């Protein structure tokens, strides 16, 4: 997701969803 806190994104990248 669009954050910069590391998690498995819904869409793309190494970070969390902005929702959660």
Contact predicate 1/17, CB 8 Å: yes
Residues, the chain: 20
Distances (CA, A) of 10 to 3, 5, 15, 16, 20: 11, 13, 9, 8, 10
CA dihedral 17, 14, 12, 5 (to 10 degrees): 20
Contact predicate 6/16, CB 8 Å: yes
How many CB atoms neighbour CB 10 within 10 A? 12
What residues are paired with 15 via a beta bridge?
6
CA dihedral 17, 2, 18, 20 (to 10 degrees): 10
Alpha-carbon distance of 12 to 5, in angstroms, equals 13
Query: Coil, helix or strand for 15?
Result: strand
Experimental method: NMR
φ, ψ of residue 16 in degrees (nearest 5): -70, 155
């Amino acid at each position: 997701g669009l954050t910069q806190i590391q998690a498995l994104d819904s869409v793309s990248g190494q970070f969390r969803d902005q929702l959660g």
